[PDB]
Design a protein around this ligand. Structure first.
Ligand SMILES: CCCCCCCCCCCC(=O)CC(=O)N[C@H]1CCOC1=O
Ligand SMILES: CCCCCCCCCCCC(=O)CC(=O)N[C@H]1CCOC1=O
Lengths: 162, 162
């Protein structure tokens, strides 16, 4: 964990975080953070290895308003796993359909709530045969991810905002 | 963890929170929470089994402004262990002495920061022969406490502010 705070630049920080997650079985991650009282998702500090095309489409299509993982993070500090049942509206189902196309079917999002009011999300996406297997994979490393999201929050907020 | 969300009142919640911690090896705990922008450290939402005489003395002496765990919580999301070196000022050394006499020698504080901008702390105090062994035992249950502090913050801020 230490290496995240004693890293020095965003490039290096992002690599380390990507490697920690990868080491926990996750090939794709996203770390997004907004400062206090903000809503400018355009100017949101973003880190990880989501497909670049998905990221740009996401941002263009205003999907942050449709993404149930985002609304959830505004309302809780607890993780949300990407289950069909979180995608409820037609919009959300079509978002689900596209997101699954970019290779984001299975995963979870840890809400991020910082000391200085920072708001964010750390998502981990995993590859598996089915949901039952994906969930086993995630559940096995869940207490580590839980520590990791707070470590990432503290060090990344310092990067993004100091 | 669910037993915490499935409880109805502060009475029931506090009993569950205290029993979990005890089952985990911690004889004393303190769960304190404030709403957003609050500085009312004395008139806060408090739960746990610290000695009653300690709490009364603490608040009356405005110890939340001296107690290093509280100032750390304002700035971070990461745990502060109750190490000798965190008490640096003379006022903190006199605090440390008085807390040691309440039996609060070995422990850690988890900073709490909620979705609706809640501010607080969840403390766990352990009885051990020495700081070597205490840190050892706290090390070994830290991933569980890490998950637990967020489950307690999410359900806690509910009962307190709704
Ligand atoms: C409350 C946090 C707001 C600040 C964070 C920056 C704003 C938008 C950043 C994108 C967040 C996501 O992209 C969430 C995610 O990982 N969704 C998964 C689920 C299925 O496919 C996906 O893309
Ligand atoms: C950012 C938090 C401010 C609001 C939370 C409630 C208000 C203050 C309540 C008292 C907090 C403590 O009591 C902290 C603690 O655990 N101190 C240990 C360390 C050695 O002796 C102790 O008593």
């Amino acid at each position: 964990f230490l290496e995240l705070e004693r890293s020095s630049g965003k490039l290096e920080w992002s690599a380390i975080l990507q490697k920690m997650a990868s080491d926990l079985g996750f090939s794709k991650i996203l770390f997004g953070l907004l400062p206090k009282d903000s809503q400018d998702y355009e100017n949101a500090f973003i880190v990880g290895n989501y497909p670049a095309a998905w990221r740009e489409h996401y941002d263009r299509a205003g999907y942050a308003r449709v993404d149930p993982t985002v609304s959830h993070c505004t309302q809780s500090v607890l993780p949300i796993f990407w289950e069909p049942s979180i995608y409820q509206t037609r919009k959300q189902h079509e978002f689900f359909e596209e997101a699954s196309a970019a290779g984001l079917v299975y995963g979870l999002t840890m809400p991020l709530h910082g000391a200085r009011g920072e708001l964010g999300a750390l998502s981990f996406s995993v590859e598996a045969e089915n949901r039952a297997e994906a969930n086993r994979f995630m559940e096995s490393v869940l207490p580590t991810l839980w520590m990791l999201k707070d470590y990432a929050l503290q060090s990344g907020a310092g990067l993004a905002f100091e």
